[PDB]
Amino acid sequence: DSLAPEDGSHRPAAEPTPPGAQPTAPGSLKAPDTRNEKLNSLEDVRKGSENYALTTNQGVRIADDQNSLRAGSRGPTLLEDFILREKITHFDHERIPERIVHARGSAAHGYFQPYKSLSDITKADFLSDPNKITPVFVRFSTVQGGAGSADTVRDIRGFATKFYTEEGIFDLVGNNTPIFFIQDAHKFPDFVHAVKPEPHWAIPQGQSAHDTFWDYVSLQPETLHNVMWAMSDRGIPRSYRTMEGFGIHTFRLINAEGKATFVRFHWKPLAGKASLVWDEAQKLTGRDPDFHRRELWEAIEAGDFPEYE
Amino acid sequence: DSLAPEDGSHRPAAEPTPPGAQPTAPGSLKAPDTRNEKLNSLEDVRKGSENYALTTNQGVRIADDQNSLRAGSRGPTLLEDFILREKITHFDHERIPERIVHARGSAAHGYFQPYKSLSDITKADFLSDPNKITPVFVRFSTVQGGAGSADTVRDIRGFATKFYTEEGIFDLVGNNTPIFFIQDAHKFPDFVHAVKPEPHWAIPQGQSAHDTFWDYVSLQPETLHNVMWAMSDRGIPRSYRTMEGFGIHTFRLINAEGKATFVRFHWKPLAGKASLVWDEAQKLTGRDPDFHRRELWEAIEAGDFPEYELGFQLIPEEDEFKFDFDLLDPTKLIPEELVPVQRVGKMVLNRNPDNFFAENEQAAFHPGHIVPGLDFTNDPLLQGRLFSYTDTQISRLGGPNFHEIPINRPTCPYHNFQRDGMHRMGIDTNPANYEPNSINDNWPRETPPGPKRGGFESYQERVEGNKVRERSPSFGEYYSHPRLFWLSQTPFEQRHIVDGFSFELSKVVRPYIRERVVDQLAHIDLTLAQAVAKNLGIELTDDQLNITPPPDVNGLKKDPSLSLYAIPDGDVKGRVVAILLNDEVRSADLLAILKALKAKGVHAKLLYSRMGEVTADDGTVLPIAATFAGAPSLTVDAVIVPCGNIADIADNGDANYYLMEAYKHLKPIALAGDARKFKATIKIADQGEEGIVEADSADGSFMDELLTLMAAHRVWSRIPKIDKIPA
Amino acid sequence: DSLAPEDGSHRPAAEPTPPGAQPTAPGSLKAPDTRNEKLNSLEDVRKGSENYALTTNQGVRIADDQNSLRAGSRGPTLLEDFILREKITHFDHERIPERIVHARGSAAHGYFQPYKSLSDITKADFLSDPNKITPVFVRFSTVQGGAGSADTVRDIRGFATKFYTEEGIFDLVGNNTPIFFIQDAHKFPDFVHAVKPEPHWAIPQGQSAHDTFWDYVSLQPETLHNVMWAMSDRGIPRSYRTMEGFGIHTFRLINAEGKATFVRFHWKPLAGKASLVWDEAQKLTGRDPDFHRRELWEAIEAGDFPEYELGFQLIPEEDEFKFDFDLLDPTKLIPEELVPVQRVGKMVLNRNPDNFFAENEQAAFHPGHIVPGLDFTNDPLLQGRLFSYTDTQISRLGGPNFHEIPINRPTCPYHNFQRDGMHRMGIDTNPANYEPNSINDNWPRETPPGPKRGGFESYQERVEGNKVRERSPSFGEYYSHPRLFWLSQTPFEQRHIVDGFSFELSKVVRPYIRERVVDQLAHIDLTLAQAVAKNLGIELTDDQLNITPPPDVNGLKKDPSLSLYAIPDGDVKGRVVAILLNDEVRSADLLAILKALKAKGVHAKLLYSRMGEVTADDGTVLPIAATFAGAPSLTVDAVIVPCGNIADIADNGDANYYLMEAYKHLKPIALAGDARKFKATIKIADQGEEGIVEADSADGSFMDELLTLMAAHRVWSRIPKIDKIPA
Amino acid sequence: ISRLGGPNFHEIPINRPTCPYHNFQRDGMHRMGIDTNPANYEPNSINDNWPRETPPGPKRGGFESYQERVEGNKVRERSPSFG
Ligand code: HEM
Ligand code: HEM
Ligand code: HEM
């Protein structure tokens, strides 16, 4: 007599299945066959659970996890209850600081490969050979809202790719528009404070529709280009799968002879471009604020891998 | 040539003014005259800004705050730019850990005073004299959602009051329901994980409508009582001003002779009880997720101070066992029919903070911050809480010295031998850091316990039993309280409870969980389980249909104190009404509307298809506060549509839907003159209908009918008629 | 009946009193009258203790601070004991990270003033007016050892001064030598790891005498100059009062017209230069490892304020390239023969702190805290430092808000848009947190640069070159500075340097390292390498013997400013003398001894075989400050042994060895009457000897000879005679 | 929590147990372990209540405190027997 249903309908199929079909599940149980060198390198720190005893962090098996140790079935809790202290303590310290910006974000694993060697223009090992598969981790995000804000807000989106290359980690940290708000990083905090909730009362959440943000804009026309994009349907995407991604800055490529070529990076969505409309987007933040995080998760379980070029 | 407008319209009036009237502002600039000893003690750490030079944190004036220092107008940034490094660094480290729970929260300052000395029952100095004013800081909150989640979610609300007393800080850390989910603090993290977003993917935010939460519930029927409240309209309040607050645990009062009296604490809202309905609440999380935080802030700027009355249920020591549930079980309420709530004093929340991070975010409430005159009981959930609220500060607020953070600073003296935290502010001059010590003549000294100004000493409760990890058998009853709750509710309240469960349950993906929760409901009440099971498409079995209901609670068949709306105490002061404008408003209509509302403290917001102005028929200029879409019916208590150029708005999608939504959410609607032609959209008869006020023009009669509908909060009688409207 | 003694001898006098006279005490109780604007600004965070009740951090009075709350006088502790949990918790979290380097350090308050306005060369407000008094806080330190390591180690000393100016905090973060170990900050961690204890086993503490440090040296001859200083008596000072201090890098001064002048900063000790010798220093780390921290503390309580004179080497812009080393190379000194030090002002350190953790431990010095009037140069070690001192605070002092920690707080205004750290004290009222902002009329505002009270603006140095990671070729000279140093030293100073290297090198286990370091020494001076190589048992080869010495430095064959003792400026005020007592001291001897010493500000400590008292021959009662073993000769500058019952101590092992150790460490010794029979132990002749003052009795002549020996600090002429004595 | 920076100090290599350790504790600072359990709570049906409590026994049992009798009042007082 255990608590799982007899017919086994607690446990999802290890199979590509559509949104709604199955309960969702950790990648390593929903898609155990999907691999790559990063995901396999994580094996040493994964922990399973089936057929294991519940224990303290120090290894001790627990016999009753339903009660504090007290003097009598109706007495005080005793300070010698180290099982309770550890369990509460760990809970007590669960949280770590959210990101200053892009605190609200959704990720996945995957891989990249070049279409052709690029050694003409760069010695970047990860671009040296179209047979070279590079594991990636990607986190898409909003910018302004906290880690528990809505997904479909009118904001810029972040689009960050960590490439785990053979000659080091390369981070491509971009947005869903090809420009930024400001020209010099020295005014970074100024702008971010301007769009972040107002300091006296912490309002509004994941919105630019307030006094201070526009005050700033109106006094710094450098912002206007990106503000344009934000106000467009670009700032309310359908899906992380259906937006373009940009490195924004001009960088350099450097080849084996030392020749520099300027470059700007792009991600082009094989899913194409698609965005919501405002009333739909705004009301959807209420009806399902995890809309993007969800859609991404499901699309992946469903075999609809997001691809970008 | 400076950047402020010439006419001075950047700067808000230092005057009580309605929602929308002025830009909002830090309490110390919006209400500089409001004071109390806490707020004045904060003066040493406030910082102004006018007529000061912008500087580095080290005091250096900055000449250019628009640029990094680079080699050339187009070169690299140099590492010697300490101005840029400090400015970015500080920004880089701005954030601190959110609360584990109740991370999403809204606060204010204020005060409390007792109605009469309470020295008969407790030596608590703050309750000793009705002339003794105690400054308070209060933070209301949700439970599950992060610090950036929505306000109007279906969750429990927290209600925490820090009393800055003369013999120490007393923290009253309560919720908006009178029970908790669980019995022993050891399962705290289990339950909280169960309702918090799911670990694999971090979904859903500030919602209980997911698999794991209900899985837990279904396996731990101890939770069912509070789950009932959550599913009721209790779990989606109108305003922090319009909910009740509860200490939950039985505590002790202790007087100058050492007599213990058991007590449970209450906050009773002078604003009365009022709550939204689900569709309204859920969609409002999208339209304005800061709805509660906003409403609180504005109500305060507006002079509508939230007030609550502190009341005690008192139970003598020799009555411990007279009730047929255990006073120490926190999943059981003490019916007010058996123990009534005695009003003891009052709290007024009369000023907003200056900086939300400084004052709200960093405040630390902890229920074990009690004072002489109070003490704990063996409630095994309370017992737990004692441990956790001190611990968690060490990582949330960065160390043991969190009591030195301004808002948390006591306002009485505090001296000891505690030395050296991280971020230590106090500089101890005591030649000694230990006691006994002869080198400073043992100062500071222990203080023997006494009538007033004494040392703390715990009530000397007899403890007899063995060291066991076992739930008290007396806690083994799960259903009679839910049942009591449910039968106290009005019929429309019960529809809501039903629809509450049905909605949540419908987003549990694994259907066997839906069945198991239904099974639990069967043990509480069969009406209820039938209605829910219908909505999930489940047939109760013969077995389930025959399940014996649990006992009355101490012979009670209902308790009217458990209903929100049993005895309406709804109060209009502070509420807001939408006025739908057209380009040609009949001014004497409008005059009379605003004049009537103003007399009863009811705020209006004038709305239109666009911003700016429109002009009255008599050429009074009417400024627009927001558009129809900008400020949806969700955000208001009623809708009024005066006469004029109705043709202007008559075919406007947004104005029509404003009315349709308002109607579906059971709000009062008032239509003057040609505005009555809008009845067509709300599929109302020509005969009239209760809840729709109508007339040739707005007069004495028209306004009074409307305001009276408002004193009823909502038009419940409308419920049967709303399923046909498509909104 | 309280625990303080009836006669009040627990509580020290609020009066300047000598070392040993009184118990030591927090500055604000020992010297309440000493003030300055910093110390008075600290008043808001000081906490007293007398006549206050002992309480929890939340304000609650405690009645019993001797017990946990338990179920029964013999039962378990209960989790509801919040008094115990808070008290233990705070203790549990007392410690914060030690400094990465200079973790071991000692501080005090004080002030500075300029001798004359300096507005000709700099607009630095703090140097604008000789009437302008600037409060300072100074922390002296070692480098390698942990916060609980010894004071008298052979290490570099740090010397950090925080100036609390009217236009911001200026941090002067220097050392006790005029150069550094390395050229580019990129190798900072490499060197520091090399000298810090070895990673496998954490050995040795505050010592450079290990394998890895010398391995590094031997492979990076850039280090050799400063290593020279370290090995000299410079690396084992007598007192923080008796060393020179250096800013090391060339900085810029910038005046009201924008003219840059290069500058290097100096502190010149009004106490003069004085240092221990190795055996004395090393053994003193065992006998009193707090020797420096103590001496500083006492000197201050005693009225012997440490004073230093701030001096500048100034070099005009067009002289950048006149020197045959690079002004930007921090491993090169600017000889005072080529650029003399101009005294500019003076600093007085006139009050100890109240709480060592509060004020010392938490203080944050950072060289990039400069003000208008000052600016940086491209010194590639300095360039580095700029980055690190802001960064490291984030984990040492727990966040970006470390400038809010009391001691670190500026004393001028500071306002900006920086919001929200961990442990945020300031509560910002600015309606705006950004600029430009119109909503607060852009306050606080940028300030254009100007003659005084202006914005900071960097000197607009021309930068021309490509982005490279390459050491300047002009830095490629390693030996001529060491050579200069060495040839400036007196012969006995050079023995010490030799013995320095020989000792350290002898504890390098892998002998090939010993050889490689010797090889380096060969390139500096062959005398030196011969002496060291002898002591390690190494034969220099023919190759090594022929190595050409490096060039003179700009035609210099020596610089007397680089010697400690070239031109003795040793000063007796503040020094201490041991007086060896017997049970029958001849009182008129002693009268004359203490009377003479007192006239020149020289402190005495009366010592005996045990504690308590002894009586004079005339029945004056002589209190004993410590025993012979309790306060070894190490801790004193000279030893005096008056007449009386010499028989009492004549055969006492400890009294004899007191003298033998004192003699081996070249200290002045003075023996009256029968005390002359002690000459026997120190293997002195009957004829006399220079450095041993002797006579029938202590008179005008006897005392003066002694004090004059003291003005010479040590008896160098004794050196040849000490190897025969076995101490 | 402050010396070693968080609740996850048992994950620091030297401190790591050498036997199995599994529970529902989630998320410290510097979390090394990546939990795959579909559930982070118990009772839980969705992972068939794993990992499970273990009743106490001769070897390999759950921990259970010795059931010492406690009798006295809640006092802050040194035992006289210690005097
Ligand atoms: C060029 C325009 C920018 C783009 C495309 C951009 C992109 C982002 C993205 C996508 C994230 C979220 C990273 C994640 O998922 O972990 C992010 C986080 C961050 N960004 Fe921005 N960013 C931009 C400008 C800036 C500027 C000007 C600063 C500061 C000067 C800044 C500092 C940060 C910091 C400190 C974090 C997150 C904390 C962390 O991940 O360690 N970024 N950046
Ligand atoms: C009796 C039922 C409970 C009530 C009425 C309750 C009330 C609350 C409220 C209102 C907050 C938000 C405080 C704020 O605004 O700062 C809160 C936070 C917290 N609670 Fe609960 N709580 C309950 C159960 C528990 C249990 C069982 C634990 C742990 C065993 C717990 C531990 C915490 C911690 C660690 C925090 C916040 C972190 C902090 O403020 O230091 N509480 N409690
Ligand atoms: C120019 C040669 C140097 C001098 C004269 C020097 C001086 C000092 C002194 C005296 C201290 C102790 C400060 C105190 O009492 O709080 C110190 C600490 C420190 N130094 Fe060095 N230093 C030098 C080189 C460096 C370099 C190259 C770095 C890194 C590149 C460095 C980074 C630090 C840090 C991070 C601290 C202490 C942590 C803190 O106070 O915030 N310094 N410096």
Numbering used by the authors:
A (entry chain A): 27 to 335
B (entry chain A), C (entry chain A): 27 to 753
D (entry chain A): 420 to 502
Relevant lines from the article:
The post-transcriptional regulator Hfq plays a key role in how bacteria cope with stress as well as in how hosts react to virulent pathogenic bacteria. Hfq helps small non-coding RNAs (sRNAs) base pair with their target mRNAs and regulate gene translation. The structures of all Hfq proteins are characterized by an N-terminal α-helix followed by a bent β-sheet composed of five anti-parallel strands and a flexible C-terminal segment. HPII is one of two catalases in E. coli and is expressed in the stationary phase.
Here, we report a crystal structure of Hfq and catalase HPII,both endogenous proteins of E. coli. We solved the crystal structure at 2.85-Å resolution by molecular replacement with Rwork and Rfree values of 19.9% and 24.1%, respectively. Catalase HPII is tetrameric, as in the crystals of pure catalase, and one Hfq hexameric ring is bound to each corner of the HPII tetramer, one per each individual HPII subunit. The Hfq ring sits on the central core domain of HPII and leans onto a lobe at the C-terminus. Approximately 40 residues at the C-terminus of Hfq were missing in the electron density map. Formation of the complex does not change the conformations of the HPII tetramer nor the Hfq hexamer. Most of interactions are formed between the distal surface of the Hfq hexamer and the conserved core domain of HPII. Between the distal surface of Hfq and HPII, we found that residues for RNA binding make interactions with HPII. Thus, the association of the Hfq hexamer with HPII does not interfere with the measured catalase activity. Given that the proximal and distal surfaces of the Hfq ring bind different types of sRNA sequences, complex formation with HPII would limit its repertoire for binding sRNAs in the cell, and regulate its chaperone function.
